[PDB]
Amino acid sequence: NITLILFLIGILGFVLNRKNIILMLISIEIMLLSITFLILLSSLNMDDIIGQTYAIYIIVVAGAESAIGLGILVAFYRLRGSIAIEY
Amino acid sequence: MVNRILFWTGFGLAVRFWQLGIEMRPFFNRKSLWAYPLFGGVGASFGYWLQSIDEKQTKMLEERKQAILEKRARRAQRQAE
Amino acid sequence: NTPTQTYQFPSKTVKTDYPLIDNDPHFTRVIRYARPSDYAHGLAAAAAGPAALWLMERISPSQVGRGGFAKAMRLAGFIGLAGGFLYFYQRSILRFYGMSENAREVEMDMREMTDRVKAGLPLYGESRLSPAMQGVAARQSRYSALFFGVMPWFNFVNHNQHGVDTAKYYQQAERELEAERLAREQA
Amino acid sequence: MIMISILSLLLSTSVTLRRDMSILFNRISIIALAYCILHDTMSLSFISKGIGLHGGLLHITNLTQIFHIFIFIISILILQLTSFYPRKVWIPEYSSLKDIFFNKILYYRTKIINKMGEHMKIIEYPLILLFVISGAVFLISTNDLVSIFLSIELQSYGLYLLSTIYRNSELSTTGGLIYFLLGGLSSCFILLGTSLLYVNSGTTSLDGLYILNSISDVNSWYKPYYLNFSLLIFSIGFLFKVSAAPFHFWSPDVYDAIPTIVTTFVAIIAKISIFIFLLELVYYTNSNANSYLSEFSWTYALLISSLLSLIIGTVVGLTQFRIKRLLAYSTISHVGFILLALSVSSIESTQAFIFYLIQYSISNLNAFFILITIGFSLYGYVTNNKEYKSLLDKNNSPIQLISQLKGYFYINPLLSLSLAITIFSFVGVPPLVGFFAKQMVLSAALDNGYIFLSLIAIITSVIGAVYYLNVIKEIFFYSPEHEVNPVLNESDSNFSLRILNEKNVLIRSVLLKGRNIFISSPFSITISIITNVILLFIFMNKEWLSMGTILVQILFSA
Amino acid sequence: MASGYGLNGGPSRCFPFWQELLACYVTNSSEDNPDGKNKCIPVMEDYYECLHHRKEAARVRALQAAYREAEAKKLQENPPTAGQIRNLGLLNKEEDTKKVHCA
Amino acid sequence: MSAMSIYIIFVSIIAILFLAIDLIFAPHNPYKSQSRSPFNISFFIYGLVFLLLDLEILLLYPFAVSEYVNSAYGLAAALIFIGIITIGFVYELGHDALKVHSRQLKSSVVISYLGNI
């Protein structure tokens, strides 16, 4: 239930935000944690170590994609000098 | 009028022709004339290969049709009861 | 010596043309059942790699610096050797799978395994792996050479999950154990 | 083999900083992918709906292996763009086989062939290229929910990297940011859909999900609403990655901003892997008995998106003036046709699906190849147009506006006809291969009672034809704005070329001009083969169409 | 779940239900009788019951109601205390064991 | 009450006491545009290579507590996994994304005398 509310918070990050692109990166991190938390709790209910394994690979991949996204942001910011959307 | 080797020999000949036209290079300069046998030779090789593929495809499709009448038969015969 | 269970595990049955010999043969079995043409195809494919890069340098020169081409050829030669070896392995293992004409391989397998039965040795040999881990190895490399264009894998384990009912090896062994018994008596 | 090549290329790449190695590394990647074709050609000698591999986490089908090879062949063709210089010097005195294979020619090539162009100096470009391929072929061969997620991220993250690898272009870094940010949101919906399947079913195995679907399709306490709803959320993320409407806004911006050579790969490879993956999942989840399951079938999201893509792709393309945005919208309309064929789950529509995907990939490849070749051809031409001067990233995207193609028929008539053939194949004019692709999809949709969608498909096709005609009108109906460069042919501006033998001894010395500078053979030949396949398909259709017929029979084999 | 590998290194607790369901499908479904997969329906419902427990929850909600309605009607003259129960089945607390057992 | 819970509370309490003393007894008086510059990419690289290498070490920790059951077969996969991530570190080292060589009399002119014309 908490995991569902957290997914909304990550969803709501995209609704409320017109100009903060950094918040877009953070809202993906919230969504991914919410989905991993749901898998972890379900894996506990169904006594299944595969759920924990799936969550570990989501942490690995979401950590890997955070680094790519920050690198892409750095290449973007090197040329623009701002992460602000003019709106 | 669908001959695999004749068509694909010509296809390779047409590839060289269109290529030279695309480059806006002369279509027949005598020192480059080896290319049309080469392009048509590779084209003929592709079409001898397509021959063998078509043969195996025909056998496999023919085998599938038999399995389809076979399935309809034993279903229809089961309905006779 | 028949264990009354010649088909211990549920295997995957695949429609092919020729009889299945082994769903997962041992690395060494796939090298020992290789044909002379398999070696011929192996190096010829391996030579193609650096030869293609060489031909791509003769017709359309890369304009690279002094030592660049030697470095590129070294990587191309290794790529061709890896690619050529996998092609050689696939040609031999496809006959075990029954996906290529394998009459010669069927014969020598029938011979080789029968000799093991009467000698007392296990059909596929002895493993240092736990039986559970042998199942893991069997379920990992089983038919794995069909995936060689993406990911390579080889069976180096001695397990008893080869996809084949093993009654055929015991019938022959028993059958020609009596032939040697009758011949011994008539002497 | 793809994994050995990636590791081997990386090790060779790791210990070098020489940007003149980039062209060589691209050629080795072509050689490496040729071995990958060989190993997968070896693997097609069996008939099966599927063989689970490697502990059941992967699988292989005849379909899977056919489209591994297709992905490899498309990647080899695209890799030519970074493996051969765009222009060459040709002369009749160096055209014999004894010449090309025993003698050498010498001239100042650097400026002529653009030896130091940006697309020839990126060492790691072929390596990131192979990473995307690995994600695409792993996604095809995926049998498990976790394998699905890992393969789609592997392919997706590589595409973000490729969109940004031109790190000095403000356009490319901007396009890389947009794809990653909206692509990362799309990946949450895929992970959410996969996770909802696991939490309800208790398995990550696609086999087990199909078994659960099959028994539940009967005609109480745990009614399986989760499967359609989860796959609906799961599918939405895949609709973004194929740029299907209404999830398509990102692609006209990303395709235009990133360099054209990058756009060629990025806009082609990803649709093939996702659509093929979706095809099997559509088949095994397709309910037979008209029960409460079929009314909530997730595949209506595919039918709605096909409808929305048919309209958006054709209507919005009407006012595009930039050529790459038009191709992006032209693609959206074509995935509308592709998604209709995937949604009708018939034997006929699956043959139509398989044929349409391959012929569109070939055709869209030709359009990009022709567009890059026209860009490399304008080197010996100048223009005084004030609009063209104000273009950004002219080196990365030489052709950015449809107006730049004005009078290209007078600059290169036969190359302009190849463009016209390709575009006429996009509209569906017989007897071009594009017509036969649309014809099969419409006949299969009509035979399954999809009358309303078939009628919208024909109506949107006429609207789509308008901007297709608009490209053709600029090439043929007007005189060009580009003039040949005066200083390239001024009766005294001649550069020198030496012809030397095997022993580096002089044979001849010839003075050359701009009219001796031609398009490189790899690009002209690839355009020429594909153009003739499009034009002459009616004489060569038996094997190509029989392959898909057999593939569908295996998939449908009761 | 269906994996067969539990949290403590042993097998997953619903795996026997998952093996049975797969066993019922493979041996009663076929190409000849597509209706043979109907038999696998109660086996499927048992598997979902092991995973989620919605039936067992429903059964105990009803049973707790009847149980907690019977204890209100009765009057407990002398119910056992926590201390005495802690002495149940012990080496030198027979009186507490007898009192709790109402023997 | 678990010894771990009381431990956490006590350590927190110590921190509050130190804050409280300096907030209550220490003196307090009211004793209380900006330029910008580019930042160094080496800081992003240190964090990036740390994170990616931190993940790979994490993925090997299950092996170290499972070595007995994994035996030879699990060791092969661990070695395959280590070999793949080692190649990415070679890329890190070979390209020096941390600027290993950040800090660093052949004469182009040779003259020849020929004499009087």
JSON list of N, CA and C in Angstrom, two decimals, chain C residues 128-129 133 136-137 140 153 157, chain F residues 69-74 77 80:
[
{"chain": "C", "resi": 128, "resn": "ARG", "atom": "N", "xyz": [32.80, -34.12, -10.24]},
{"chain": "C", "resi": 128, "resn": "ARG", "atom": "CA", "xyz": [33.06, -33.52, -8.94]},
{"chain": "C", "resi": 128, "resn": "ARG", "atom": "C", "xyz": [31.92, -32.63, -8.48]},
{"chain": "C", "resi": 129, "resn": "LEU", "atom": "N", "xyz": [30.91, -32.43, -9.32]},
{"chain": "C", "resi": 129, "resn": "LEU", "atom": "CA", "xyz": [29.79, -31.56, -8.97]},
{"chain": "C", "resi": 129, "resn": "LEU", "atom": "C", "xyz": [28.71, -32.36, -8.26]},
{"chain": "C", "resi": 133, "resn": "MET", "atom": "N", "xyz": [23.92, -29.71, -8.86]},
{"chain": "C", "resi": 133, "resn": "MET", "atom": "CA", "xyz": [24.66, -28.72, -9.68]},
{"chain": "C", "resi": 133, "resn": "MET", "atom": "C", "xyz": [24.87, -29.30, -11.08]},
{"chain": "C", "resi": 136, "resn": "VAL", "atom": "N", "xyz": [21.95, -28.21, -13.00]},
{"chain": "C", "resi": 136, "resn": "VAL", "atom": "CA", "xyz": [22.13, -26.79, -13.39]},
{"chain": "C", "resi": 136, "resn": "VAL", "atom": "C", "xyz": [23.01, -26.71, -14.62]},
{"chain": "C", "resi": 137, "resn": "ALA", "atom": "N", "xyz": [24.09, -27.49, -14.65]},
{"chain": "C", "resi": 137, "resn": "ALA", "atom": "CA", "xyz": [24.98, -27.47, -15.81]},
{"chain": "C", "resi": 137, "resn": "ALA", "atom": "C", "xyz": [24.23, -28.03, -17.02]},
{"chain": "C", "resi": 140, "resn": "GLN", "atom": "N", "xyz": [21.90, -25.58, -18.43]},
{"chain": "C", "resi": 140, "resn": "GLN", "atom": "CA", "xyz": [22.49, -24.37, -18.97]},
{"chain": "C", "resi": 140, "resn": "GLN", "atom": "C", "xyz": [23.05, -24.57, -20.37]},
{"chain": "C", "resi": 153, "resn": "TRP", "atom": "N", "xyz": [28.89, -20.88, -25.06]},
{"chain": "C", "resi": 153, "resn": "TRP", "atom": "CA", "xyz": [28.87, -21.73, -23.88]},
{"chain": "C", "resi": 153, "resn": "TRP", "atom": "C", "xyz": [29.34, -23.12, -24.26]},
{"chain": "C", "resi": 157, "resn": "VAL", "atom": "N", "xyz": [31.17, -30.31, -17.93]},
{"chain": "C", "resi": 157, "resn": "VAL", "atom": "CA", "xyz": [30.76, -31.03, -16.70]},
{"chain": "C", "resi": 157, "resn": "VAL", "atom": "C", "xyz": [30.50, -32.47, -17.11]},
{"chain": "F", "resi": 69, "resn": "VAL", "atom": "N", "xyz": [28.60, -24.27, -1.79]},
{"chain": "F", "resi": 69, "resn": "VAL", "atom": "CA", "xyz": [27.56, -24.84, -2.68]},
{"chain": "F", "resi": 69, "resn": "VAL", "atom": "C", "xyz": [27.90, -24.47, -4.13]},
{"chain": "F", "resi": 70, "resn": "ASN", "atom": "N", "xyz": [28.43, -23.28, -4.33]},
{"chain": "F", "resi": 70, "resn": "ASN", "atom": "CA", "xyz": [28.75, -22.78, -5.69]},
{"chain": "F", "resi": 70, "resn": "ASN", "atom": "C", "xyz": [29.85, -23.66, -6.24]},
{"chain": "F", "resi": 71, "resn": "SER", "atom": "N", "xyz": [30.85, -23.96, -5.41]},
{"chain": "F", "resi": 71, "resn": "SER", "atom": "CA", "xyz": [31.96, -24.84, -5.81]},
{"chain": "F", "resi": 71, "resn": "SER", "atom": "C", "xyz": [32.57, -24.39, -7.14]},
{"chain": "F", "resi": 72, "resn": "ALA", "atom": "N", "xyz": [32.95, -25.33, -7.99]},
{"chain": "F", "resi": 72, "resn": "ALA", "atom": "CA", "xyz": [33.59, -25.01, -9.28]},
{"chain": "F", "resi": 72, "resn": "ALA", "atom": "C", "xyz": [32.66, -24.28, -10.25]},
{"chain": "F", "resi": 73, "resn": "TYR", "atom": "N", "xyz": [31.42, -24.73, -10.36]},
{"chain": "F", "resi": 73, "resn": "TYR", "atom": "CA", "xyz": [30.50, -24.16, -11.37]},
{"chain": "F", "resi": 73, "resn": "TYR", "atom": "C", "xyz": [30.19, -22.70, -11.09]},
{"chain": "F", "resi": 74, "resn": "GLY", "atom": "N", "xyz": [29.81, -22.37, -9.85]},
{"chain": "F", "resi": 74, "resn": "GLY", "atom": "CA", "xyz": [29.59, -20.97, -9.45]},
{"chain": "F", "resi": 74, "resn": "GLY", "atom": "C", "xyz": [30.84, -20.12, -9.54]},
{"chain": "F", "resi": 77, "resn": "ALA", "atom": "N", "xyz": [31.27, -18.79, -13.20]},
{"chain": "F", "resi": 77, "resn": "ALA", "atom": "CA", "xyz": [30.45, -17.62, -13.48]},
{"chain": "F", "resi": 77, "resn": "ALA", "atom": "C", "xyz": [30.96, -16.38, -12.76]},
{"chain": "F", "resi": 80, "resn": "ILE", "atom": "N", "xyz": [33.88, -15.32, -14.79]},
{"chain": "F", "resi": 80, "resn": "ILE", "atom": "CA", "xyz": [33.38, -14.67, -15.99]},
{"chain": "F", "resi": 80, "resn": "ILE", "atom": "C", "xyz": [32.91, -13.26, -15.67]}
]
